[PDB]
């Protein structure tokens, strides 16, 4: 029974953007760029989470079938 959510969200307005400076962000790059063992471990994390590739599905894909480039595609094909 709310359109706008009626509960507040701890926004650090007194911190102007965010508490993250560009210097903090660029220090993440410094760790990533550095090579050696710590950068390699975080690369292994990326490869485990995302390295095995992906597949697109649409539930009821066949029913979407439409002439796009004057020829049939489903939304998954598109």
């Amino acid at each position: 029974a709310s359109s706008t959510p009626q509960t507040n969200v701890d926004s650090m307005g007194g911190g102007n953007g965010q508490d993250l400076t560009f210097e903090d962000l660029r220090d993440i790059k410094d760790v990533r760029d550095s090579g050696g063992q710590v950068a390699q471990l975080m690369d292994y994390k990326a490869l485990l989470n995302f390295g095995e590739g992906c597949e697109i599905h649409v539930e009821g894909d066949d029913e979407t079938k439409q002439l796009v480039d004057g020829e049939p595609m489903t939304l998954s094909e598109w």
């Binding site: 090579g35 050696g36 063992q37 390699q40 690369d43 292994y44 490869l47 485990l48």
Partner: protein, 113 residues
């Protein structure tokens, strides 16, 4: 570290002969005297079954080969380099206990692939 190990083996991996001449608190021995003793004990012309006869005031001491674990330093260096280059430890002709078996093996070879 590799250069350091090679230099360390050259100095410390092999025992070296130390002939001490003269009596302790006795008469001093000068360089020209040691030249003649050096000629007697020269490792260049000594052979495996040479024997020595001396007065009491000549001591054939030795520098032992001073034990250090260069194998462990090599294993550490190779672990550092292979992991830095993203290769498995096994690529460097170095291995580790447990990691050659079961799910520990399966993970590292999965990461490589």
């Amino acid at each position: 570290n590799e250069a350091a190990i090679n230099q360390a083996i050259e100095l410390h991996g092999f025992p070296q002969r130390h002939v001490k001449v003269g009596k302790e608190d006795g008469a001093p021995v000068r360089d020209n005297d040691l030249r003649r003793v050096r000629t007697i004990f020269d490792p260049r012309t000594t052979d495996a079954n040479t024997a020595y006869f001396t007065g009491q005031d000549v001591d054939v001491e030795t520098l032992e080969a001073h034990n250090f674990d260069y194998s462990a330093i090599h294993e550490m260096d190779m672990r550092n380099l292979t992991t830095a280059l993203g290769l498995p430890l096994e690529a460097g002709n170095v291995g580790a206990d447990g990691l050659g078996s079961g799910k520990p093996a399966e993970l590292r070879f999965a990461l490589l692939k």
